[model samples]
Target chain A: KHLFTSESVSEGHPDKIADQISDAVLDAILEQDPKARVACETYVKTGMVLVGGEITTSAWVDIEEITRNTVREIGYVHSDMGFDANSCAVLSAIGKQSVDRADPLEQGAGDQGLMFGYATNETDVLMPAPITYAHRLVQRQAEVRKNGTLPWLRPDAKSQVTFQYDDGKIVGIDAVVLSTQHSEEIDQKSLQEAVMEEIIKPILPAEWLTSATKFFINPTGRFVIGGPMGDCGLTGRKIIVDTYGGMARHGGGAFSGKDPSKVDRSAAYAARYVAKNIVAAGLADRCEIQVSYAIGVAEPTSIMVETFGTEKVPSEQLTLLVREFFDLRPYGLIQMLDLLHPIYKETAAYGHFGREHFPWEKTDKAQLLRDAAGL
Target chain B: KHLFTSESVSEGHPDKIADQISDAVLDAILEQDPKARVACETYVKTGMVLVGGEITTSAWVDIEEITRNTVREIGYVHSDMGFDANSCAVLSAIGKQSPDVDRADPLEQGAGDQGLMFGYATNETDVLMPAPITYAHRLVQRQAEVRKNGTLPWLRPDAKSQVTFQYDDGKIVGIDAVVLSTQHSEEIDQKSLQEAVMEEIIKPILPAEWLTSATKFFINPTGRFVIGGPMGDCGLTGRKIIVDTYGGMARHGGGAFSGKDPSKVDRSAAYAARYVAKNIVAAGLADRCEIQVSYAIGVAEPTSIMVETFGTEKVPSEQLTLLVREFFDLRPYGLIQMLDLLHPIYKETAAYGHFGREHFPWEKTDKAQLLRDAAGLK
Candidate 1:
């Protein structure tokens, strides 16, 4: 038995906020120029914001205004928050790497990147429980703050959840750390009580929160400064938080800023899609898929699947079923996930895999894989 | 059982060159002030190089001079390479963040941000690094050596290598494919370069036993990579993290160790975990091990340390976990002192590979005896 831990920062956290801002820009640009090649990056500090990256598009949206509106939406409206939306200097520098174009039909993956996708039966959502609830803590914080449940809660908040695992299964909660910027009006004692009652008590599974479960609210006391004003957060900084919560291996590619044409983003999203579908097919209790692509190769150079010994069929069968059923090609993955839309901003915050709404999260092919395996 | 892959980039690659400048600045400042707080980031374009991050120190050094000299040393000296060390504009946007942060012991220093890191060691290579990445790093490492040694004078600094290893029942059987795209002088023909790389670079480095007739090689496949380094693309630090670590063969915390000081657990704890994993593997407790260690900001001890031996452990995985907790000090300050990470050595680790190298303090197998004795050796 060992303790496994994962953490998530609220949308208001510096790095996450930067992520959202970058995606929002991509969203708006993608809205107009769906074919726009945008690999946008953003950096936010105490007072200013710098945004830049590889972008090839005819359509031009007001980046400064778009950034302010995005920052404004995240609840950093005033000067007292230490980072005023309208005032922060927003700067833009942006890519042309050999664009000798290949057709989706003829084109291999644009970039040679390695992406790992994972799925497990550990939670109802088929995601790891530690990251699922870690997100819930902060997701609850945002809903509570925005819904006026506890208006004193500031925009910036962070949460860490550790769970006790035995024999590859989660048994109980070990500890939870929640640090939130709050108004001076609320005392630490009351804040702790309210957070435990309103936030912590509700999101976590009640049975898991036994007497042994420890809660450390604001371990570093007095967090008046929050969000971009408090720390420097760069775009793609939250890659671990965004995917798997460090529960599974990653492709080391940042998902938020790039367009779907870039293999890094699309390949990662598709890998998860494949793994989740295989898992939902009941062929395995948990599955991780690794796909490696070489430049200018339409199909992946090597495609591998790992079930961690939970597979109901031979491992080769699982691999063959994947290759047979799924489109393991670069263009095939993008189309399989229906990725060319302006829907990436919603994925910027929270864990990307567990949520059910994404097309990639759908078990649409589960029936196919099940029947194929049954054959 | 499957085809495993790993990749590595030469120091001259655009992203790595950016890392060198940042670490060069970091290494320079730490020499003057070991206690100095620095997490530098570098950005390089056609003719401009910008270094920015928060720096809280009493130490003063020439930022532009440091940037240029590091660039020059990386062999970006000429304008024809598209990025000139002497001619580029160097800029800095550094600020401050801090206090007399209290801790009973200096080694008990708190961590920053909620971060998670992973460390892995396998018996696939002599260094205990995973196979694909171990050889992947060697190919590029030799690329630089040959260039510097004048054996391949036409070779430029920018290069990339990827290896795919075929495994059977979780054991390596043979090499599946090798892809190497190296930058060289425009005069060198493609066939000559490919032949030379196979004979000189690939042949000399990879295990000949694994280089069977079935092994495939793709060298300079993309044809003209003549526009090497920054001229071909914009580069920044931490972009090539996949090449830096296990090349997707292992898990990685999103934190990049390139820019940050060792005080940050993302860098320090990772180094610490690598030490523990290496020792445990050396003790013969496991043939492969990947340990997960997590930290909460402002907390001294790791929230948890998870050891997964993938059924390769001679003893129970849980037992190894207890041994690791007892044998290694995973604390932030403990890790720093244990490894002596506060020196000017980070710049050299900015590229190739941080682990597997014999020189790094974290790669030592010093605790093997204690771990073996604790496990009651088989």
Candidate 2:
């Protein structure tokens, strides 16, 4: 048996707060100018939010308002939550994108980086089980906290799930770590009990929770001072948590604030689309697709697919099918995934890949892939 | 044949600048207080540098000076380079580390956070580094070397290099593409810039056989890149995590290495994990090895330890894991002492791949013979 683990943080967590604000600014810009080049970054601290980055666009955005709204919507409306959206200082040091970079008419990638996308049939959501459960555990914390299912629970929380796998399938969860911020009024025993019964028990499958399972609830004991007040938060620090939760190998390109023109964001989305379709098409039980591009180049520099021996067909054959079915070039991906739309704000909070209705999450290409593979 | 890719950015790249400044602050503090707890994060924009994070230290250092010195050292001294180190505003918003979290023991402090970390080693390069990232790093390193040495005076500070390698039977065969986009002076035309980059940067760095007629060379494909660095984009401390490690050849715990102190498993544990993987590969136990270790906050021992040999291990991976535990000390404080991590060596690690650097204690194979003997293998 092998043990695998992944972790997730709530939207109220400091890094996620930065991510949300960054994407909020991006969404605000894309709404007015779809072709704008944006690379917005945000840093949060006690009573302050600093917005910086470069954006090339004809449209204007009130970044201060957008950041405040993003924080307010994330349930940081009052100082009692460790941060106050209305009173916090919003600082902007935004700059225009460089003009010396050759041709603007050519829709080349804004930057150069590598991106990886992965999908597996190990879970019902077609996501890795460890990361899927990890995300769910924290997602449940947010739901219970906001819905008043747990009134004492605060907004900041984090969850880690480690699964025991026999062969390649997960048999049970070996351990769980759920740390959530709460009001000072709640005692440790009461908070632990409430979190166990209301948060952990409801989100996790009963059978997977065995007597051998170890649980660490607020392992550091107290988390009353949380969010930006507790620690500084910067944009792109939580790239792993925002994507696959470390269950799959990451290309390390951060996705939160970038526009679709940057291959780091758009190509990653397209890679996910291709991987999910490969799995859905029965080409492989698990699929990982990696495609890389250079700035000012439309065509991908390289494309690689790995099934890890869980292939329905030969891995080589699956690669051929991928090349036949997917348009992985920079501009090709932007068009194939219909990524020019302003749909990134919803992607900022929850994990980016597992959610439904996003154009990249569609299984529309599965049949095409299957037919191409002659399966 | 399969393709593997990796990228590297010069030290002047915005994200790398943030990384360097964060480490500079970390190094400055560690020089005085070895046991200091620091998570110094940096954000850079047009003419401003914001440094903030939770830090607990007895040492007093000028963060603004450290930030400026870092930018200046990265060749961003002139405004024409898009960033002026002396002119840029350096803002400090640092806070003290929370005392509510426990940190009692000097040898057994708990992990700072709960997350997974991966360490990988391959036989593709002499340093056991993956070829794609190794070459990718060299290309950009060459760019800096030429620009600074006056070999290519028109070259600017900011640059990026991407290398795509064709692999056959798990071995790299040749290069598929070589993309080097560098900021240059307006006096240099596109043709001159491309030819100069190919001859001065690419030819000197990459192996000749790898550059065949099929190799696609892209130098300044966007035509010009005179304006770069913070003026062109935003940079954050941990944005280049992939470039800092195995370049996506292995899994990442999502934890960034920059601005983090030894107490944080996000940095210390990752270095420890790499040491373990490298020793195993160097011992000839496996041609490729990837290790995953996860820990909980306040937990000294890892919650889980997983080893994948990629079908290259002679012994069972489970037994190899047992030998690894016996040979390596993975506990929070144990790893710190074992690797001698509380040093001012981090600033040098912010740009290039962290693992392959020989001076870093984690890159040493001192434990390989011990591990091999303990495994009862030759």
Candidate 3:
């Protein structure tokens, strides 16, 4: 038996807020210039928002309004929430992308980096059990808070889930830790009971919950002063939470604020597409694909696939199938996934993968891969 | 045979500049207030630097000077390099750590957040690092070396190296590809640039045995890279987490280490995990080992500890887990004292792989003999 763990943060969390604002700005730019080069980053604290990064575009948008609107939408409109959407100062330190490093001629990759994509058959959603449930815990927190099922629930929350496995399959959840900010009007005992009854019991699977399961609610004793007021938040800090929630290996590229032109964001999305399709095609029980590119180069410098000995066929044969069915190059990826759109704001929160709407999460290529692999 | 890859960036890279500055500030503050709580974040662009995040300290230091000196020391002193340390604007938006958050007693301090961290080690290299990242780092290290030593005057500071290795049955067999991009003067043509990089950087660093007729080399594949550093792109601390750690060979908990203090589990626990994994590997119980540990806010004990030997363990993994628990203390403060992490040794760790470095206390193998004895190894 082995134990595995993963964690997730709510959208109201400081780092997620920064990620949203960064992506919102990118979306606004991409709506106008679909080919714009954007690398916007955001930092949030008590009463201020600092936006800085290199962006090359012909479009102009109100960054201050975008920043304020993004925060307000996340339910940070009042000071009682720890940060006021209308009042917080928004500072811009934007600069033009260096011209000497021109856009790669003939459609080369905007940047050089490594990106990893992973998928597993452990869950109905084709996601890892630990990370999938971790996202649900926080997603439920946002649900009850907004739906008024739990009035005392605040926006800033974090949840960690630890699962116990026997012989490679999850048998039960061993521990769940949920720390949520709430109004001062609620007592600790009441808050804990309400969270257990309303939030915890609803989100987690019943079969996975046993007498041995331990739950820690608001483990810090109190979390009234949370959000950017109590802590600092920076964009891309939640890359793990936003992706696989620590269940899989990451190539270390952040995706929130960057545009599709940069391989850090687009290629990562494409790698996920490749991995999901391979698993969906029944070539492997679990698949992980790593692709590396150099700047000013369109094709990947290296492409590697690992199935952890779970392959239905030879590993090299699966690699050959992937090459035949997928366009793993930079421009090919943008075309493969139709990535040159303003669809990133929705991805900035609630985990980037496992969601249905994003194009990268689509399994439409599964049939193509299956036919090609003759599975 | 299978292919594995890793990449590295030089210190002059924009993201690394931010990391160095954040650590330099951390070093400055820790020198005066060892018990201070610091979570400094840095963002760098063409002509400006923004330093923010929360800090609770009794010490006072000029962050602007620290930022400039850090940049100057990184070879960004002049404008011809695309960014001038003296000319860039320094902006500060720091705030005091919240007073409402109570700290645990001196003996037991709970983790500030709930997250998981992973540490890994392999017997492939002398330092137990994976071979791909180790060689990738050496390539860029040589680029900086020859650039500074005047062996290649046309070379600029900003550079990147990616290495692809062929692995057969858990052992590296040959090289597949090597991609090195370097900022260079306009005077050098493509032919001269390629030959210079091949002879001065690649030949001196990579082992000749690994090189084959099939090895593909791409130098400055994008043609020109004159515009580099923050001028080319924005840089933020922690963006290079994979480059700083096992280089995609292990899982990451998403916590950054550049500007954080030892009290933060993101940095301290990660170092401790590395220490635990290295000791286990050195004990010869496994050829490759990865350890994963998790903690909740304000908790001293990890919620879970997992050890995977990749089918190489001589004993059951559960037994090795018991042995680790008996030997190591993972409490935040305990890890600080065990690894001697209170010093200002983080700045040098900002660029290269943080694990392979010898000076960092976490790399010590003094516990290997003890662990081997406890595991009942002959």
DockQ of each: 0.52, 0.78, 0.74
Q: What is the interface RMSD of each candidate, in Å?
A: 2.2, 1.2, 1.3
The pairs that clash in candidate 3 are B110-B298
Q: Per DockQ, what order, best first?
A: 2, 3, 1
**What is the descending lDDT order?**
3, 2, 1
RMSD of 1: 2.1
Task: Tell me the TM-score that candidate 1 gets on chain A alone.
Answer: 0.97
**Residue B267 C-alpha lDDT in model 1:** 84
Q: Flag regions of model 2 displaced more than 4 Å.
A: A99-106, B101-105
After superposition of all CA atoms, the RMSD between model 2 and the true structure is 2.1
Provide the DockQ value for model 2.
0.78
Per-residue lDDT tens digits of candidate 3, residues B241-262?
8888888888899999899988
Query: Candidate 3 on A1-375: residue-level lDDT in tens?
Result: 888899999889999999999999999999999988888889898889989887889999999999999998887877887998899999997888654334433476766778888898898767888888888888899899898898787899999999998966889999999999888889999999998988899989899999999898988687888889968898999989887877788888898889887788888888888888888888888898889887766678778899988898788888898788888878788888998889999999888888878899899988887887676
C-alpha lDDT (0 to 100) for residue A257 of candidate 2: 83
Choose 1 or 2, whichever is better by lDDT. 2
Model 1 per-residue lDDT tens digits across residues A138-224: 999988999999998888988989999877777899989898888778888899998999999999989899998878898777777
Task: After the best TM-score superposition of candidate 1, give how far the Cα of residue B290 lies from its true spot, in angstroms.
Answer: 1.4
**Cα lDDT for residue B336, candidate 2:** 88
Model 2 chain A poorest 10 in a row by lDDT: A98-107
Provide a comma-separated list of chain B TM-scores, one per candidate. Answer: 0.97, 0.97, 0.97
